[PDB]
Design a protein around this ligand. Structure first.
Ligand SMILES: O=c1nc2n(c3cccc(Cl)c13)-c1ccc(C3CCNCC3)cc1C21CCCCC1
Ligand SMILES: [Zn+2]
Length: 118
Protein backbone atom coordinates (compact mmCIF):
# COMPACT_ATOMS: atom_id res chain seq x y z
CA UNK A 1 0.00 0.00 0.00
CA UNK A 2 1.55 3.31 -1.15
CA UNK A 3 0.83 6.31 1.09
CA UNK A 4 2.09 9.88 1.73
CA UNK A 5 5.05 10.55 4.02
CA UNK A 6 3.76 11.06 7.60
CA UNK A 7 4.54 14.64 8.78
CA UNK A 8 6.47 13.04 11.65
CA UNK A 9 8.84 11.47 9.10
CA UNK A 10 9.27 14.66 7.09
CA UNK A 11 10.07 16.63 10.27
CA UNK A 12 12.69 14.05 11.28
CA UNK A 13 14.32 14.21 7.82
CA UNK A 14 14.49 18.01 7.99
CA UNK A 15 15.90 17.94 11.58
CA UNK A 16 18.61 15.44 10.59
CA UNK A 17 19.68 17.47 7.56
CA UNK A 18 19.51 20.73 9.50
CA UNK A 19 21.86 19.16 12.06
CA UNK A 20 24.30 18.25 9.28
CA UNK A 21 24.03 21.66 7.57
CA UNK A 22 24.39 23.63 10.84
CA UNK A 23 27.34 21.62 12.19
CA UNK A 24 30.49 23.56 13.10
CA UNK A 25 33.86 22.05 13.96
CA UNK A 26 35.94 23.14 16.96
CA UNK A 27 37.21 26.22 15.07
CA UNK A 28 33.68 27.36 14.36
CA UNK A 29 33.80 26.45 10.62
CA UNK A 30 30.52 25.29 9.12
CA UNK A 31 31.65 22.26 7.17
CA UNK A 32 28.57 22.08 4.92
CA UNK A 33 29.19 25.52 3.35
CA UNK A 34 30.74 24.42 0.02
CA UNK A 35 28.36 21.45 -0.29
CA UNK A 36 25.10 23.44 -0.20
CA UNK A 37 25.29 24.03 -3.95
CA UNK A 38 27.05 22.13 -6.74
CA UNK A 39 29.64 24.00 -8.86
CA UNK A 40 28.06 25.54 -11.96
CA UNK A 41 28.28 23.55 -15.22
CA UNK A 42 30.04 26.52 -16.81
CA UNK A 43 32.78 26.87 -14.19
CA UNK A 44 33.43 23.17 -13.61
CA UNK A 45 32.19 20.89 -16.40
CA UNK A 46 34.69 18.20 -15.48
CA UNK A 47 32.64 17.68 -12.26
CA UNK A 48 29.61 16.72 -14.40
CA UNK A 49 31.84 14.57 -16.64
CA UNK A 50 33.43 12.55 -13.78
CA UNK A 51 30.48 12.37 -11.33
CA UNK A 52 27.60 10.09 -12.33
CA UNK A 53 24.92 11.52 -10.02
CA UNK A 54 25.75 15.05 -8.74
CA UNK A 55 23.97 16.09 -5.59
CA UNK A 56 24.16 18.95 -3.10
CA UNK A 57 22.33 19.83 0.10
CA UNK A 58 19.95 22.17 -1.73
CA UNK A 59 18.75 19.16 -3.80
CA UNK A 60 18.46 16.95 -0.69
CA UNK A 61 16.20 19.52 1.01
CA UNK A 62 14.09 19.73 -2.16
CA UNK A 63 13.75 15.91 -2.23
CA UNK A 64 12.51 15.99 1.35
CA UNK A 65 10.01 18.77 0.52
CA UNK A 66 8.80 16.86 -2.58
CA UNK A 67 8.55 13.60 -0.60
CA UNK A 68 10.98 11.74 -2.84
CA UNK A 69 12.59 10.03 0.13
CA UNK A 70 10.15 7.46 1.58
CA UNK A 71 12.38 6.44 4.55
CA UNK A 72 15.37 7.61 6.57
CA UNK A 73 17.33 5.02 4.57
CA UNK A 74 16.46 6.80 1.29
CA UNK A 75 17.68 10.08 2.81
CA UNK A 76 20.88 8.42 4.06
CA UNK A 77 21.59 7.04 0.59
CA UNK A 78 21.56 10.56 -0.91
CA UNK A 79 23.75 12.02 1.91
CA UNK A 80 26.22 9.13 1.49
CA UNK A 81 26.21 9.76 -2.27
CA UNK A 82 26.98 13.45 -1.69
CA UNK A 83 29.96 12.48 0.49
CA UNK A 84 31.02 9.71 -1.91
CA UNK A 85 31.03 12.21 -4.77
CA UNK A 86 33.18 14.63 -2.74
CA UNK A 87 35.68 11.86 -2.09
CA UNK A 88 35.55 10.83 -5.77
CA UNK A 89 36.22 14.29 -7.21
CA UNK A 90 38.51 15.78 -4.56
CA UNK A 91 41.96 14.59 -3.45
CA UNK A 92 42.49 12.50 -0.30
CA UNK A 93 43.67 14.90 2.40
CA UNK A 94 42.01 17.96 0.83
CA UNK A 95 39.79 20.02 3.17
CA UNK A 96 36.69 19.12 1.13
CA UNK A 97 37.48 15.38 1.18
CA UNK A 98 38.14 15.40 4.94
CA UNK A 99 35.04 17.51 5.63
CA UNK A 100 32.87 15.00 3.74
CA UNK A 101 34.04 12.18 6.04
CA UNK A 102 33.06 14.24 9.08
CA UNK A 103 29.65 15.09 7.63
CA UNK A 104 28.92 11.34 7.07
CA UNK A 105 29.56 10.79 10.79
CA UNK A 106 27.49 13.83 11.79
CA UNK A 107 24.62 12.49 9.68
CA UNK A 108 24.78 9.05 11.32
CA UNK A 109 24.80 10.60 14.80
CA UNK A 110 21.91 12.93 13.98
CA UNK A 111 19.85 10.03 12.62
CA UNK A 112 20.46 8.05 15.84
CA UNK A 113 19.58 10.95 18.16
CA UNK A 114 16.57 12.33 16.25
CA UNK A 115 14.93 9.08 15.08
CA UNK A 116 16.07 6.91 18.04
CA UNK A 117 15.68 3.78 15.88
CA UNK A 118 18.57 1.77 17.41
O1 LIG B 1 32.29 17.22 -4.36
C1 LIG B 1 32.10 18.43 -4.35
N1 LIG B 1 33.16 19.19 -4.74
C2 LIG B 1 32.99 20.49 -4.92
N2 LIG B 1 31.79 21.13 -4.75
C3 LIG B 1 30.65 20.40 -4.32
C4 LIG B 1 29.44 21.03 -4.06
C5 LIG B 1 28.37 20.31 -3.59
C6 LIG B 1 28.45 18.91 -3.45
C7 LIG B 1 29.64 18.28 -3.66
CL1 LIG B 1 29.71 16.59 -3.23
C8 LIG B 1 30.78 19.00 -4.07
C9 LIG B 1 31.93 22.50 -5.10
C10 LIG B 1 30.99 23.51 -5.24
C11 LIG B 1 31.42 24.76 -5.61
C12 LIG B 1 32.76 25.01 -5.90
C13 LIG B 1 33.38 26.34 -6.27
C14 LIG B 1 32.67 27.57 -5.73
C15 LIG B 1 33.56 28.78 -5.97
N3 LIG B 1 33.71 28.94 -7.42
C16 LIG B 1 34.42 27.80 -8.03
C17 LIG B 1 33.62 26.54 -7.77
C18 LIG B 1 33.68 23.98 -5.78
C19 LIG B 1 33.26 22.72 -5.42
C20 LIG B 1 34.07 21.44 -5.30
C21 LIG B 1 34.81 20.99 -6.57
C22 LIG B 1 36.08 21.80 -6.87
C23 LIG B 1 37.03 21.85 -5.69
C24 LIG B 1 36.35 22.37 -4.43
C25 LIG B 1 35.08 21.56 -4.11
ZN1 LIG C 1 31.13 5.23 -6.70
Amino acid sequence: KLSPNPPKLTKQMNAIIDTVINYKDSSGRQLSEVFIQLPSRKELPEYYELIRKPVDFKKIKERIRNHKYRSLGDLEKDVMLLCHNAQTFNLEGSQIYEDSIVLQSVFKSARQKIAKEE
